[PDB]
Amino acid sequence: AAAISCVGSPECPPKCRAQGCKNGKCMNRKCKCYYC
C-alpha cells in the first residue's frame, strides 16, 4: 500500500496535495510522499 495511485496523470508529489509535496518515490502503481 501507498498514499496515491502513481498512474493518474502526474507521477506523485503534485497529487499528494494541491500545492504538491517536497518529494516522493513510486515503485509499482503507487507512491510514498517525502518531507511533507
Please tell me what DSSP assigns to residue 20: -
| Total structural domains within the chain | 1
Helices (H), the chain: 13-16
- Dihedrals phi, psi of 18, to nearest 5 degrees: -60, -50
- Dihedrals phi, psi of 12, to nearest 5 degrees: -150, -70
How determined?
NMR
Spatial CB neighbours of 21, under 8 Å, sequence gap ≥ 6: 12, 13, 14, 33, 34, 35, 36
- State whether the Cα torsion 35-17-19-8 is positive or negative: positive
Grid cell in block for residue 26: 513510486
Please tell me what DSSP assigns to residue 31: E
Cell 510522499 locates to 33
